[PDB]
């Protein structure tokens, strides 16, 4: 398409030479460059202090994993190994056994945070919508053991975020 | 229900004479609230009019694929694959 970066001799004779020499003799353009930051100082900065103010987000955002449940009790996860095979990090492990009598829903359910690159693939591959990614930021531990999620339990403890998840999924069915 | 000290959740054993469990001593171990699936049986069974009924959690919004359940035998009510909800007649 061509645009050209080269100026091809801005100075020609007398008048065009002197002003190109004036900027190199003293400064001028450095004083003009000084004025750029000068007005930039006066205008209000966009700063957010975290313990009081919070930054912008979205209805669909992936953070720490938490598995959802039905409104009338019952664990929504059905045990498929579907999310296990899609997982590109292989962070999720699943071994399933029959629950007492009749029902067949999970036994071993570990999601590694040492692994997991956060895709929302396990959210997408799930037909029952068990793992739904909630707006999470707060996670800090002393050990790997405290960081990697155990057999559901702490994932089921996502009830504190499941109220937000139920609100966020209402913006998810028939996507946006 | 709890055995000795640690409480069992979703069918889990604590320790055989305290050998495996040692990490959960200073820090308190996690436990899921009402993980015995008591809320599954707590829900009342709905009466059916047709021979086969379709199940749904709450339309397309809540994650539930549609499964038809047959009702032919009088003894033992039929339940869907996803829910613990039972149907009669």
């Amino acid at each position: 398409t061509y645009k050209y970066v080269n100026l091809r001799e801005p100075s020609m004779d007398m008048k065009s030479v002197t002003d190109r020499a004036a900027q190199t003799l003293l400064w001028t353009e450095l004083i003009r460059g000084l004025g750029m930051t000068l007005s930039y100082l006066f205008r209000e900065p966009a700063t957010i202090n975290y313990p009081f103010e919070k930054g912008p987000l979205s209805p669909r955002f992936r953070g720490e994993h938490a598995l959802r449940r039905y409104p009338s009790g019952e664990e929504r996860c059905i045990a498929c190994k579907l999310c296990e095979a899609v997982c590109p990090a292989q962070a999720i492990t699943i071994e399933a056994e029959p629950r007492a009598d009749g029902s067949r829903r999970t036994t071993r359910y570990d999601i590694d945070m040492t692994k997991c690159i956060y895709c929302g693939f396990c959210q997408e591959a799930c037909p029952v919508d068990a793992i739904v990614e909630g707006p999470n930021f707060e996670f800090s531990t002393e050990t790997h053991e405290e960081l990697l999620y155990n057999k559901e339990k702490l994932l089921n403890n996502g009830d504190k975020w499941e109220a937000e998840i139920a609100a966020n999924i209402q913006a998810d069915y028939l996507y946006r | 229900x709890x055995x000795x000290x640690x409480x069992x959740x979703x069918x889990x054993x604590x320790x055989x004479x305290x050998x495996x469990x040692x990490x959960x001593x200073x820090x308190x171990x996690x436990x899921x609230x009402x993980x015995x699936x008591x809320x599954x049986x707590x829900x009342x069974x709905x009466x059916x009019x047709x021979x086969x009924x379709x199940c749904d959690g709450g339309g397309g919004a809540l994650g539930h694929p549609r499964v038809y359940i047959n009702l032919d035998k009088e003894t033992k009510t039929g339940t869907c694959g996803y829910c613990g909800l039972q149907f009669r007649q």
Partner: protein
């Protein structure tokens, strides 16, 4: 008796005030670590100073992926650090190999090279979540040297 307990908190307040981290550009995480400088989410002169330097810095952030080539390289940096040193493993690669892991070259855990005090789980570790890592570090410093 009362002066002994209160003076210990004053030394801990000095690290609660300011923490100088190491600028390791060894990751995609490092671009999110550059978002700590980006005005919208700032710990800059709230505690964090981007001057870094291998010797003067108190904190070192291990940003993301580490290979077996960088395993002896990052270890000698840790030895140059002063005695009050805190290591943040920001990113899933730093926690135990987010991706790769089972790969030949990538070192698993980072704790096999350098011990970690604060873990940040996020791949693209959002600057909102990154703000916790420094705030938790300041909160974790409670009591040092009783006798």
């Amino acid at each position: 008796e009362y002066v002994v307990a209160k003076l210990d908190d004053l030394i801990n307040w000095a690290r609660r005030s300011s923490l100088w981290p190491m600028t390791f550009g060894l990751a995609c995480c490092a671009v999110e670590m550059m978002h700590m400088a980006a005005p919208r989410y700032d710990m800059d002169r709230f505690g964090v100073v981007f001057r870094a330097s291998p010797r003067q810095s108190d904190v070192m952030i291990v940003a993301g992926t580490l290979t077996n080539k960088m395993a002896p390289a990052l270890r000698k940096v840790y030895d140059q650090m002063p005695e009050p040193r805190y290591v943040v493993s920001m990113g899933s690669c730093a926690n135990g190999g987010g991706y790769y892991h089972y790969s030949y070259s990538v070192v698993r855990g980072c704790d096999r090279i350098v011990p970690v005090d604060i873990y940040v789980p996020g791949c693209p570790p959002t600057a909102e979540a990154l703000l916790y890592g420094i705030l938790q570090l300041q909160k974790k410093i409670k009591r040092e040297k009783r006798l």
